Design a protein around this ligand. Structure first.
Ligand SMILES: [Ca+2]
Ligand SMILES: [Ca+2]
Lengths: 509, 514, 509, 514
């Protein structure tokens, strides 16, 4: 079950990957989650067929497939790694790591996110080993332990490549650089000085090749320094260039550790920005390289200068009440009331790990959200809907230049699935209701849907083989966000958890 | 509108085109959807409308549809009612089963359930006849057939004039009350160790046909079980070549050409002109037969797949086995065709009634059978090896033969590398659907056999495709999983592997873009 | 992995089996456990070599192998049934019953004891099914349930053939006759009228073809009728011809259910019989067909008329104090003191399931025993040694004509292993100390020993292939009797439990 | 009497005949017991004295014996002291291991431990050097070598002039302090991904020999690890044919006949007359070599098993590989001999020093190696098949070649059907002991190769036979279990199976009737 090859992936390649491939977690290193491919447009997306599906191992499916040179690399729950013909669905090889039993939590935990570099596939194992497999055969190139004990420190977002260095987080409590050839540790940074869900940068890590900076976030666990903090570090040495705390007094497990994206924007924040918390009145206006996105579950969209971390603006998305205000320098003041009384949002967020996408060409950011609040208390659960809100699942389209909401669309069932932007002005998203849906980037209108065997829980991607654009997504398991459907009073949501699979769609052509 | 109607004999005898309420859509077992929205011209446009995850284990199931609901048997006797257009679960019955590997292993899959009144009927894994309320999945009646172990069911129960009837897999066939389940009769086989296959009720002649002493076909009355006629289709069987497979009752101008491919024997007398007929291939051997549906008079017989278990066939019903194929002492390469999974097996054939074309899923496959003395002592102990291989001039396993039932002549035959081992579905738009061991779900032209469209399921495409209608839209549905005996046939492919994924169990439903 | 054959076993064959075969549990149907083979004698037994061994499944090994026509039939723990070339140790076939989990209790419970009849091997499964396999292929001929529920009623001694009928006990609470071709039940007898270890005839059942009577015992659970009772029934109908209670007021779980043997003897009981409890003074003297042996753990040796159950004599073996006296008709009076105070023997007996043997030619009975008592209370356990007794393991040789002890030999380590008599005047026995030993029937002297990988826990047998006499025994697991070694103050006993195997020995020749 | 003596270098260099205190009985690794009580005349009388159950897993172990005690490594690093004459357990150390399948899989078996002072030494599965007290099994020292995962040990540590030394399986060889375990040196290989095999210390020349850049033999000083000489025995290796196998140091009148079977090359210059020598077959390939023990000057080289990985061999140490055997594109049947388990592997050879006869366990075995294009796209993906088969004219796998080390000529060669894959033991009574994949434990005549006696173990007879003495009685001991890679070779046997039982793990000890 082997291939040889080529086309060995350099740092230059990761910095300018082929339009038709998906070789970083967000396809480009600055993230975005945007396929520049254009065959599938709004006019024809309603014709999309299933080309092929393949069954995956049971467990939570949160995976972003990678495609290189016509090969799909697919991490299954339980550290089963597969390489599949990305046009036909024929298995090439499969590598099963021997585990087993009880570490950090119908089978496994997500190994969602892998990296390609040189001729290796890299992932962090359920027991915290950095592991490199050969692309051609699935054979182990190296297996190195990052922990000591053993322990119960894990990792779910996975490693990324940053200028030859392999960088990875945790779920002790640090981010670490590693040698791409040996896997030996080059540096580690902890988050918190020396004197409640997941803890310690298990979110997505973003490398910008232009400024040569790696960006990661910490979680909670004075302001409680440096909890829930965004860090911009150099990749070879881990040195810290700039930081900023996005949520100080966190009593709600809001985990400011999700993907932030680096891009060029005309910085032109509007005072009519919805959910506006604060615009720095001393910041320049005009073209600028920027770090922007929603880092925390609480839903605040921020923009910083990428390089200096100069604060630009901050703004609400989902209704929330943990944050009383943010000043002119982006210092957050938490609502001490919550730390009468309806806490919004939840510990499953307005947002959570399911990633936002950015269309770089129009500068629209698309974030999958959930309208949900806590509660003092079909059958019963801890959550409830925010005031005057009908539906739970939501996607918000926001202009990263002005901060103005372009549109905002909802459906009853919880979302809790990533979105994928494409060059054809169409946006894909799954969801807790098993639906895989195509929306218009222009309007938010649904142009196409299918329905998967399970919750449409994983990251949609897009790639090309022989001129055909493909769109793929997995795949299933039990989703924390399907439990959000308890707040729905008018309908049960059929969140089937068994039947895991990856699915690949295409124009009939 | 949304009225959820009772199912009567009569609805069973005359189904609306949009429904699939008998195992084979009609009681006569054609497996033909008369719907036409999907044609040879547009089938290429088919989209996935919805899928839904099923329980793990092997999927050999034929869903039933009635008034917008899909009723679907999952392995482990989990029964589901699913909204047929959207995939919304309506209800799910999980029957408390004692323990797996206490029951018959061959009873893991459930192929068929029956609909009657407002109940769904299945025979459990622990050999009970169970009736669930269509509205809710709550138990209406649970009735023990007897278990003194490892006796279950495979192909499902049917309705025959207000009477529930099922086989078993190990001998039994029984008739039951449709409101109570009480046993009304019992016919004994002593294959005689199982009437496990599909049972076919003709509401015209009031005759029930099942397959078995040593492979005989039986025509019994549904009220009493009284044997009206019978016929032995493979006598000295030395290869588990059961003849319990679905036979079809149809009217057809019987004018059998003497040019039948694989012609074994027609007849002197005979008749011609027709004739309500039982026909099809009942054995694993792949021999196609024809009888008078009410007398069981022999009409004609032909070969489909290559075989050599049958020497000749006299003009009256026969059979005389080829002795060259029987392993009797010793140490020599025996070539036996086909295999224990045949060229043909449970995966059902379809017949298009309008065209008179019979569509049979096959496998080009043989084995070398050698028994070799281990040279132990004290004892003459032997090892016996069955290596599977392709027949004389075949590149490909897995095939569909379309055959005219009037002439007995072959319309077309198409192959592909991977084992098929999957049922076929005929629709009124001139398209034929078939699964396969390679995960692919394909639409074929009924005219030419050409592949017009395919998609690939997450698992082996192992269950029966059906078609139905909701609000004027035609859907095509199929499941969906597990490990298949058919997958093993691919070992005969030299070098190339076929990705027969077992995990990922699901039912899928396709339709034209609306 | 198959054979065909022949030599189909009739009732006539079971009644007069070949000297060189072992086709009933005790080789002949009347039990005895005696190989009429003569090659191995006292003069040459010291030369015995290992010919072959084969590994068995883990779990308790209590098995009596069967040999027919050069084939060994061997029941492994967990209902794994093997047929092995009995001269070479080559596996022919193996049948694994699919079980699993928790029923009546390093893997399985003993399926010790199987029967051969016609061309089938019969056993009762761990979940109480009567199961018939073809001798040639290991294929299931029939599998029928004897219970209803399911339950927790099991069986460990196994079925026997009695004139075409298959008879079997339990561990609800009855003995049952079954059809040899279909396995359907023909009759069942319960033990106890309608108004604490194992309960309900899980001991060995004895069929006499001469009187056509089946003999079985009940366990405990007024005299408490009919507890701990010996029953003589007809095989086709189960009808009860005679009975006798061997231990009425049982508060010690003494289980009068072990093998009793049917033989012709010159009835000539001596008043100088050791441990003498009672001789019926009204019973005839002279040649007579008799039922004799030790049915209960408490060690009393009885003799009855086989046919009428007329009581002949009763006599102690191991020291005991549960029984105050037995009258002239064999009615037992229990010592109400125990029901100050050292209760002898134990619940693991003087005797337990490990079987006695009888040499029919000299009329000596050989019983493996254990000198052990309870206690009011190396490390610690519930047991202790009886007054003035040094060693735990013991074998007693008793004349069944006079009741007089011929000899009695002991060793420190607990015995708890069956004995096998042979025609060459040598007696085999294993033990809790891993030793497999050959004793002189004349003297009790040890003439030969080897040492097995594990406790020598199973029944030794003997058979012939091509003129060579073979002696075989298994095999291991955790033995209840190895726990008896706690009462040893001067030495630990190395009772290795892992390494299960059957072993076959022979003269070098 | 019962004095339990300390082991010094010197006792190690000059073992009493009755003891087995170095992996191969003597430091020079002959695996020869000089005891004579057991002879070719009476070995047929051998009785089982005692056995004892071992932990499950694969048994490749060589027990050590000293002053009446057997020290025995069980899989899972359970270490036992057993009374050597009776089988009474004395003590058992169970090391708390983190979790299986976190450690190197190839480290499951432990072949060797070392004795020194009053401690037993082993390298753990988790790559620690551990010293246990001979008296008790209590831990004296536990020292971590480094683990950054899946690095363990296989063949055991040795003593070399007060220095503990071991390889690994993935590169490392290291020297340690005998009282503390502290690392005293480290030699790096970058097979170079493992010096996993047996390591041979010569106390005469003070030289340690292990097998590896690309398969070279190394002679290092025990104090410092300083490489004194080296030699590459298989350069362009394309078949995992490691050369880490035991080589032997012996004095031998070097007069190599030019009639050596499988003669590759002798020499012009050379010397003759002898010479303390390193010799034996170091590769899986089965090529027998000879060097000066102190210079590593090349002397001669021959073939044992059939092979074609080696083309030719120049008169100076060579090697030049046959290119016909390297799989380079495509679609053709490659015949490569031997296999990845060779004709030779870890199972050790024995040398009788008095007779100068070298006794090597082999396997007549080859494979057909074909790579076939799957015709995927996009990608050129291949399947690669290794079917195992017998060599040109062989009926039998599994063999012992006895070869004279002075002449290089073959004394005898005997075979049997089943794979061997088991070490050999030479004794001073002129008998050779060998296990096997067929469970049989056999004594051979060193004179003729004839089988003089056998018994059958409960499992594959997979570990090394040794011999020792207690109170004047000679014992022969061997274990004892698990699943063997060698068992797979039997697939090349057509029809006949060999009963390679994996469960039943044990050590057995035999002796003459007393
Ligand atoms: Ca069958
Ligand atoms: Ca290696």
């Amino acid at each position: 079950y082997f291939q040889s090859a080529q086309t060995a992936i350099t740092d230059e390649m990761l910095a300018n990957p082929p339009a038709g491939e998906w070789i970083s977690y967000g396809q480009n290193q600055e993230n975005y989650r945007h396929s520049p491919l254009t065959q599938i447009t709004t006019e024809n997306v309603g014709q999309l067929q299933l080309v092929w599906a393949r069954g995956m191992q049971p467990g939570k499916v949160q995976v972003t497939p990678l495609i290189h040179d016509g090969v799909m690399y697919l991490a299954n729950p339980g550290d089963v790694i597969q390489a599949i013909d990305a046009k036909t669905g024929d298995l090439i090889w499969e590598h099963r790591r021997q585990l087993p039993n009880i570490a950090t939590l119908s089978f496994g935990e997500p190994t969602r996110g892998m990296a390609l570099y040189g001729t290796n596939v890299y992932f962090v194992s359920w027991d915290n080993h950095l592991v490199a497999l050969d692309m051609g055969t699935g054979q182990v190139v190296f297996d190195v332990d990052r922990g000591q004990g053993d322990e119960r420190v894990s990792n779910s977002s996975g490693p990324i490549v940053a200028n030859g260095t392999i960088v990875a987080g945790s779920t002790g409590c640090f981010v670490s650089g590693h040698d791409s050839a040996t896997g030996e540790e080059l540096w580690r940074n902890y988050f918190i000085p020396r004197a409640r869900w997941m803890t310690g940068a298990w979110g997505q890590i973003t490398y910008d090749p232009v400024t040569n900076l790696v960006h990661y976030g910490s979680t909670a666990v004075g302001t409680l320094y440096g909890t829930n903090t965004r860090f911009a570090v150099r990749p070879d040495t881990g040195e810290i260039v700039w930081r900023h705390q996005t949520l100080p007094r966190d009593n709600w497990d809001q985990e400011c550790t999700f993907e932030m994206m680096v891009t060029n924007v005309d910085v032109q924040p509007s005072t009519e920005m919805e959910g506006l918390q604060s615009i720095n009145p001393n910041a320049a206006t005009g073209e600028r390289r920027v770090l922007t996105g929603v880092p925390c579950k609480t839903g605040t969209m921020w923009q910083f200068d990428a390089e200096t971390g100069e604060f630009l603006w901050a703004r609400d998305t989902n209704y929330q009440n943990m944050i009383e205000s943010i000043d002119e320098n982006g210092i957050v003041t938490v609502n001490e009331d919550a730390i009468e009384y309806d806490v919004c949002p939840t510990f499953l967020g307005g947002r959570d790990w399911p990633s936002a996408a950015l269309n770089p060409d129009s500068g629209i950011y698309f974030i999958p959200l959930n309208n949900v609040c806590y509660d003092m208390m079909n059958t019963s659960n801890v959550t409830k809907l925010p005031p005057g809100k009908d539906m739970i699942g939501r996607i918000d389209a926001i202009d990263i230049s002005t901060g103005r909401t372009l549109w905002s669309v909802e459906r009853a069932a919880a979302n809790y699935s990533p979105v994928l932007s494409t060059g054809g002005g169409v946006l894909f998203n799954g969801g807790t209701d098993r639906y895989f849906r195509a929306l218009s980037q222009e309007t938010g209108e649904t142009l196409w849907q299918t329905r998967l065997a399970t919750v449409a829980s994983g990251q949609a991607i897009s790639y090309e083989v022989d001129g055909m654009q493909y769109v793929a997504i997995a795949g299933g398991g039990v989703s924390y966000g399907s439990g959000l459907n308890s707040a729905l009073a008018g309908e049960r949501v059929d969140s089937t958890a068994i039947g895991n699979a990856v699915y690949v769609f295409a124009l009939p052509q």
